[PDB]
Amino acid sequence: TLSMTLEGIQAFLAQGGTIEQVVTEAYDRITRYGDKAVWIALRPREEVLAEARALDASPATGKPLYGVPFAVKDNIDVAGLPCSAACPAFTYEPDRDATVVARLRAAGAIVLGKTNLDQFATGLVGTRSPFGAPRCVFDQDYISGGSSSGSAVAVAAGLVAFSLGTDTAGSGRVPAAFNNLVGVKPTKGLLSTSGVVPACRSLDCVTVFAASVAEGTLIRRIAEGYDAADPYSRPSQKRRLPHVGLRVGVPRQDQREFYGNTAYAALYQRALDEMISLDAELVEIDFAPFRDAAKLLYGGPWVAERLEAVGDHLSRAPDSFDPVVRSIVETAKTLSAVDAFRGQYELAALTQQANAQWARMDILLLPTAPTIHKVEAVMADPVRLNSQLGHYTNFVNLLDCAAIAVPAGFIETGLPFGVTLVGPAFSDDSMALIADRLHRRLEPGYGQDRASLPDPVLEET
Amino acid sequence: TLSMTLEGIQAFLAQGGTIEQVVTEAYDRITRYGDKAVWIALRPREEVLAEARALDASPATGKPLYGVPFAVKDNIDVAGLPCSAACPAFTYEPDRDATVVARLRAAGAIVLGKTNLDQFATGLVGTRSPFGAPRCVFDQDYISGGSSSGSAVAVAAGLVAFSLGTDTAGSGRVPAAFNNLVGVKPTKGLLSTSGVVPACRSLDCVTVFAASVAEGTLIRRIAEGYDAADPYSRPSQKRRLPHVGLRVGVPRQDQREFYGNTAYAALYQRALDEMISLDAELVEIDFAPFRDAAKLLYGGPWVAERLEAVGDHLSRAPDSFDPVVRSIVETAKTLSAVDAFRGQYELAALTQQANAQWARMDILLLPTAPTIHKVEAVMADPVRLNSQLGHYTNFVNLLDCAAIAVPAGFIETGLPFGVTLVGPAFSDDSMALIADRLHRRLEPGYGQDRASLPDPVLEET
């Protein structure tokens, strides 16, 4: 009767259970789950059992994650397992663990394996894998989100205790809203991209899907650290927030788009309807400079970082690509450095305008996605429909912001609604607090069953 | 018997002199000087006399630059005067003063006018203007430096009390070494680029040519300030340095290139021979990551910012360009955004490696230029010979460093040698001190006659 959380695994072990049983159970849940599209490479049971055993003999000293099972987006290098980024021809077999996998496996955590993703981290839908679309936990018709699709599913279903996503567009925040989870997006640089296939290399962040903020946070702190081999790695600053007097920018009502979702529109409002019983002071801000900057990521020159990354393969084997992703990268070929530099000129401008709005607010509260689609709707509007989801997300890394997505409630169809809390760089540890108190105010439950929330609860410092 | 410095103009005025006499004198020195290539637009004497008069009636209250004459690189917008950037067809007549010209004219300073430059700020020689090469103050055969050529000449000759350059490559530091002056390059953002023709727009800094550090510094503080209309404007931080225990990185001896200048090579050494009687502790550092990053500015994708800037004109009238500059910008057309982003990937890497060396040192002491050329040598090797000068300079803005160039001595031919002191961002006010004590240790004189140095002397805080 296991609870697949950090706390939930502490207790199973504190009461005569074994890591070996945990892995056996996890592999039971997996073999039964029946969304065929969560995994690209599961380990041999007897590979994971033999290392479970090896851990049961060890002390749990200096192991904050003793015997904890977790999943890894198949764009993050786990050794022993091949890495494909959902592009079979792109497949390779890493000799070494990505740093943040190394840092985590040494805290005692175990990998069952590589989850499905939107190919090359180019999407927000989960539909762009040859291994197929994962689906929401609450309705097989509806998309898991993207691009870290099978990684949110795995935690929400209860196959694993946490997963590792990656974020550039919204890929570590949108899947978290669609499967009722906490999605932590760290300031870029806090976590190594060493052993991560690059998407938008300057922007990519390694993220954490978890059951609570407190556990996404802790897993972050273990994975967080300077990596000299990561040119874009940054040593941890630690700027903080007020919690007495805290101001919370929301967009203007005209600047509050939902693309026809009445429902989410009513539910985002509900966040503000339950947020008044909070020590959260409201501010109405100009959302344009974020909206407009969010557009630069695909509607600008940045989409060409992806071209540097996969470009060789695109000339070696352009058919081996997801047709959609393919249509997106092949148009970046037309982009010149004039275009590119011009794009940073607009970014610098919007940054000024952004910093203006950062004066009126202490943090940003947004609909993680304005809506959510049926899989078949996006098999037929694979582009326009996928872009709608990046309406409140795509500006976050470009503007050196940090974010945390949390469950925010449910609509009549039984589909969830997640909000994201966006904040300035390195405000991670104190923004994390606020995202707990709010999560525990709106939908104090996680995952497939809106399961009860693992203690501890976050308390200030 | 006027001294054309801030101090020197204080005293002329404190002793019954008039601004009107000052301008009359300045215009006398100009009409007599006989380098035909210092100016692109001089004002009407009567225009400057009538405003001299208007100032003599005013109080000098809140006017730190009462009646002070100064020159402006013809890429900086002064109203009343046209701006060409040394490209006649590019000529326009600004309606408004560039911000830093506005901030300075209001402190009481006066403009005689627009100095010659390397066309579109693309050079370090001074040779690339249709209005002709200015020349060193110490030998007509030898180049003034670039790209802010006529602006250093004007101050060193004594036509004006200070000038305004612009820096991206080394254009506000090299002309200062070749005419025995203090060249102050501010952290980028400190000074507005509003009303400046862009070269490498993300990198351009507005600089100050002066007689002493104390006066380049003061003029900076008046021009220094946030400009909301400048996307790349940054409000002034103010990080500082140690002066007790101060470490001074020099390149390794293998990393000490002079391109055959025995002489400068001996003279840079002399800096280190007279620097021992200083409270300056030596460090030998790895200069590669700076050298290698300096190369990215023209030997990389950045040369394409210039393409955004002038590119239209290059299509409208590509003949109206300086043939050399033209050959440089027309090759940037081949650069893609892949190339561009790839260039920032290198920069991020070298930045890491740079930050390593910034741990071994507190500031960087370098030959402003490894050598210096005859004009005719560069009319015939206009490219390879111009690039040699950027060997210790071109990395400074790319790496968000701040610099100050000072006179460092002379060789047998009677040609001077300037060193540059490069430091981290916003270390301007404290780095400025060190560059005074060193200047007043090596060649405590300024300009054409190695004139005595205007007090005050810099003292810590």
TrEMBL record, chains A, B:
Keyword Nucleotidyltransferase among record annotations: no
Superkingdom, taxonomy of origin: Bacteria
Amidase domain sequence ranges: 22-429
Entry keywords, A to Z: Hydrolase
Organism: Granulibacter bethesdensis (strain ATCC BAA-1260 / CGDNIH1)
GO molecular function, one term: allophanate hydrolase activity
Listed EC numbers: 3.5.1.54
Protein name: Allophanate hydrolase
Entire protein: shown range: 2 to 462 of 592
Keyword Hydrolase: yes
